[PDB]
Design a protein around this ligand. Structure first.
Ligand code: 1B8
Ligand code: ZN
Ligand code: ZN
Ligand code: ZN
Length: 393
């Protein structure tokens, strides 16, 4: 399981995520598993479903053990539930180790698996604090690093219905996947991969918001999310600014809402009217930041429907959040992202698989120094529910 063994180990469908092959059980059942840095459960479909053709069959695994505890995982717009267990787990195009991990066998779901794409399960790569049913359920990556000698890091190259590829480097960094400098931003708190944005610019123009507005009520790095999602106030300022820049073209409201495509005759899309977006992340040094800059080729996603397949058509992939900024696939496809859990930090460097203009490029640039660096994190109002629960850990 070399870094060369790990290169190009991801596949997916456009806007339906990236998945990696894993083997569960003995004898080995192979499944395609979504890589999800925004949750913390390893869960696999384990019963028939109209949109699956394989699933994890507990009864075929000699190594499976039932934990005799169910789990229920609600989302804003769907759910999964299942039965907790443990089994031997391997990643065939990854490190040459095998581990006993927690696995939730998914027995019912709603709007979770969908038509087309080809994963049967999710690998929650974030921290125990957001695991279901509670943070005593050790996540896969925790188990990987506690049971083997794999270094406590992994990296993601996501290259951007169309088929997509990429790489997850487990336990290292592969220098072939990126060009130029690697910049690190602190992980603010180990739950999500929470980071702190200090400044936002649209074509070099500062949004000039209180920087806490950028991180309201959190900012996270999430391979499980398609869009760049932005807090409501922030999202409105960004759309006003992008609208201003692209004003030679007057799009319907549906477009800005992500509910409608806009099209140009093949080859003729005016990329130059759409601005770049730079998010400045807290540096490792106090008073420092660096910026990650994305092109409209990342936030305007190609979509191919029929009859007028002669046109290139696009959806706007920046959307409104009430749960904070989410740096989803729109951001991550620009970059090689290092999840350096050992050193409690996330790195960004420019990806070798750039989707880029003849005249412009996605960039990772710093330092930028500030005197009077205000504190830009937001403190989430502490609920009694959260205050009461004891953590003897
Ligand atoms: C990580 C995951 C699968 C979690 C999830 C659960 C549910 Cl119930 C619905 C959507 C999603 C979901 N939403 C995505 C899109 C998506 C989806 C999806 C969309 N609908 N259902 C799954 C699969 S992989 C990706 Br990336 C997003 O909201 O941006 N992501
Ligand atoms: Zn394989
Ligand atoms: Zn107690
Ligand atoms: Zn706890």
């Amino acid at each position: 399981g070399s870094f060369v063994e790990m290169v190009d180990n991801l596949r997916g469908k456009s806007g339906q995520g990236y998945y990696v092959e894993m083997t569960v059980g003995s004898p080995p059942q192979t499944l395609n598993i979504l890589v999800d840095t925004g949750s913390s459960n390893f869960a696999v479909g384990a019963a028939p479903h109209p949109f699956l053709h394989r699933y994890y069959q507990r009864q075929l695994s000699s190594t499976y053990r039932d934990l005799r505890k169910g789990v229920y995982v609600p989302y804003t717009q769907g759910k999964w539930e299942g039965e907790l267990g443990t089994d031997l787990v391997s990643i065939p195009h990854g490190p040459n180790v095998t581990v006993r991990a927690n696995i939730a066998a998914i027995t019912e779901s709603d709007k979770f698996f969908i038509n087309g794409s080809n994963w049967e399960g999710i690998l929650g790569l974030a921290y125990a604090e957001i695991a279901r049913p509670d943070d005593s359920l050790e996540p896969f990556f925790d188990s990987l690093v506690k049971q083997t000698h794999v270094p406590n890091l992994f990296s993601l190259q996501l290259c951007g219905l169309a088929s997509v590829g990429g790489s997850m480097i487990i336990g290292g960094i592969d220098h072939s996947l990126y060009t130029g400098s690697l910049w690190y931003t602190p992980i603010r708190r180990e739950w999500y991969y929470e980071v702190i944005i200090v400044r936002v610019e649209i074509n070099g123009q500062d949004l000039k918001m209180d920087c806490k507005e950028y991180n309201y009520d959190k900012s996270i790095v999430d391979s499980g999310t398609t869009n760049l999602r932005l807090p409501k106030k922030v999202f409105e300022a960004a759309v006003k600014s992008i609208k201003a820049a692209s004003s030679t073209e007057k799009f319907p409201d549906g477009f800005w809402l992500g509910e409608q495509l806009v099209c140009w005759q093949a080859g003729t899309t005016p990329w130059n009217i759409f601005p770049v977006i730079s998010l400045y992340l807290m540096g490792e040094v106090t008073n420092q930041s660096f910026r990650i800059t994305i092109l409209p080729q990342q936030y305007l996603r190609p979509v191919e429907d029929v009859a007028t397949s002669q046109d290139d058509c696009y959806k706007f992939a920046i959307s409104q959040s009430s749960t904070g900024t989410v740096m989803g696939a729109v951001i991550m496809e620009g970059f090689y992202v290092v999840f350096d859990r050992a050193r409690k930090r996330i790195g960004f460097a420019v990806s070798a698989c750039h989707v880029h203009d003849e005249f412009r490029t996605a960039a990772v640039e710093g330092p930028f120094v500030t005197l009077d660096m205000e504190d830009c994190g937001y403190n989430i109002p502490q609920t009694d529910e959260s205050r009461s629960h004891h953590h003897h850990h």
